[PDB]
């Protein structure tokens, strides 16, 4: 007799999936929700190029370490496992991580001269302030973005220098304080046994006496420099007053607002490419909801998971 049967699809698919009551169930159709593929290289992010600090690190970069060049904007900031050139002179960077967090969000960044080299310091010495910790082509040198002030004649007179903010945004400013290894040196440089420094915006107010001592030489300097920074609002005023022991700003930075950025640590080299998602391991091109690649991502990215596989069954059980 004539027959009519009802039945279902089967095919050559060996693709296996997982359910709660049974493991490795071969099914007719499925999708993979997990991207295990990355492009193996650092890329541009949504057009913008990153900023690769190279041997220089954030500190060396903002302080104008001679080994860097000493530009303006970035999608994200990249440091290599070893970023050699540090803070040049042995010393301490105060609230470093905070600062790195402040740059962590921004792309705006106009470096200007807040205290123009020649004009600003009539009674003190601009050019004599080098050190053996900071080579420039083998010579004895210093940072680009800071001016180290010293005796002129035997005179190191009081200085009040004031920058009131005419820009439209926050201005990041750096300076430094020198604590000599000898009262000798102190009187060889700043001429005043007792000296003070102090600085105020409405935000920041502080005063330093040099604390004199020699703790073991780092880069053969037992003296120390402590590097400081602050953000001055617009229409506010930063004021420095020193009878000695002050490394003044030269180029200070102005930061404006677009809301994103970040920092990456990778030895992965920068290639020519573009991606909407970037990890220190490599870049990512996927539409997928999940990624096992790296926990650190930038841009529009899939969620990170410890999963070996995530596979969603679409079709039915496969029974040929």
């Amino acid at each position: 007799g004539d027959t009519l049967c009802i039945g279902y699809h089967a095919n050559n698919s060996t693709d296996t999936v997982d359910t709660v009551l049974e493991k490795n169930v071969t099914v007719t159709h499925s999708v993979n929700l997990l991207e295990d593929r990355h492009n193996g290289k650092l890329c541009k992010l949504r057009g913008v190029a990153p900023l690769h600090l190279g041997k220089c690190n954030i500190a060396g970069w903002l302080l104008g370490n001679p080994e860097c060049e000493s530009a303006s904007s970035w999608s994200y900031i990249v440091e290599t496992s070893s970023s050699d050139n540090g803070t040049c002179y042995p010393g301490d960077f105060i609230n470093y991580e905070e600062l790195r967090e402040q740059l962590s969000s921004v792309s705006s960044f106009e470096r200007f001269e807040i205290f123009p080299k020649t004009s600003s310091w009539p009674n003190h010495d601009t050019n004599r302030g080098v050190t053996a910790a900071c080579p420039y082509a083998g010579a004895k040198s210093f940072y680009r973005n800071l001016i180290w002030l010293v005796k002129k004649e035997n005179s190191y007179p009081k200085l009040s220098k004031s920058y009131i903010n005419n820009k439209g945004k926050e201005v990041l400013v750096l300076w430094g304080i020198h604590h000599p290894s000898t009262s000798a040196d102190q009187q060889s440089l700043y001429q005043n046994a007792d000296a003070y420094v102090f600085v105020c915006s409405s935000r920041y107010s502080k005063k330093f006496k040099p604390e004199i001592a020699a703790c073991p030489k780092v880069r053969d300097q037992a003296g120390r420099i402590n590097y400081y920074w602050t953000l001055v609002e617009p229409g506010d005023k930063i004021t420095f007053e020193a009878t000695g022991n002050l490394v003044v700003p030269r180029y200070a930075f102005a930061m404006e607002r677009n809301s994103g950025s970040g920092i990456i640590i990778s030895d992965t080299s920068v290639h020519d490419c573009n991606t909407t998602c970037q990890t220190p391991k490599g870049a990512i091109n996927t539409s997928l909801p999940f990624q096992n690649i790296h926990p650190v991502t930038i841009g529009e990215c899939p969620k990170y998971v410890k999963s070996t596989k995530l596979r969603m069954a679409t079709g039915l059980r496969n029974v040929p």
Binding site: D2, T3, R100, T297, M312
Partner: protein, 171 residues
Amino acid sequence: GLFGAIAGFIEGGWTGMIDGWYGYHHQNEQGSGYAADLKSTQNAIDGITNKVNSVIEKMNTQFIAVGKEFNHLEKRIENLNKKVDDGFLDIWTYNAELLILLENERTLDYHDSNVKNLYEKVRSQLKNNAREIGNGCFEFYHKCDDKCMESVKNGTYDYPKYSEEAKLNRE
């Protein structure tokens, strides 16, 4: 299965039906072949599609630079940050894998339910005019030609017409 159709009383699938998930295979006086019922298949695809799309939509993320730096006197809050990132990681992985398993099960159950639904639709349609063999097959007590079969498939099947022709053969 749960609805006992797939890997059920219907033992296996047909490599020979390429046009859809669910369907029929028939023997006739005009000959035989596999053909898929595209309405139930299509609904299945609507559902599965909305399931996957829903899955993907149900996770979308908010903005952070995962880069953060602490010094050697900051160790505590460093380990706290770590505890955060890791805890969240575990939570999400768990959510993912669980969702996947549960929706795979629900999906297979879904296909099964659909096939069973179809078979009951047809059975209910035919009534006594045909006999139920199993393997989801019917043997007609009368002559069901192309038009007849396709009438079953669009659900327009006419019992009254074949009532007697069936009766006589049911003897």
